[PDB]
């Protein structure tokens, strides 16, 4: 509770900050890329998806089979992420 006190008082801006960063499509990994606009992606649920690249992620930062964050509403790639033992 003492650790949750200062963070509980710091939880006010979490409501105005809840609208961003909300995007999570189960971190689906891509397979390949036929052309630069359209990217073939495969989710862990054995469902292959295709979406265009967003303007916030450069095309040179895309790697074959890379786990990156992706929207579940616009389906676009908002921000990537760096991550066996």
């Amino acid at each position: 509770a003492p650790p949750a006190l200062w963070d509980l008082a710091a939880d006010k801006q979490t409501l105005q900050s809840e609208q961003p960063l909300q995007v999570a499509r189960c971190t689906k990994i891509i397979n390949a890329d036929s052309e630069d606009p359209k990217y073939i992606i495969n989710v862990k649920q054995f469902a292959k998806f295709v979406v265009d690249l967003s303007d916030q992620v450069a095309p040179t930062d895309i790697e074959e089979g890379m786990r990156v964050g992706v929207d579940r509403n616009k389906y676009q790639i908002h921000i990537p992420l760096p991550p066996p033992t």
């Binding site: 469902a47 292959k48 998806f49 295709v50 979406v51 389906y75």
Partner: peptide, 16 residues
Amino acid sequence: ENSEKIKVNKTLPYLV
């Protein structure tokens, strides 16, 4: 116009 809506209707197939 009717040829212009091809871009907004046929934009991106979301699944396979």
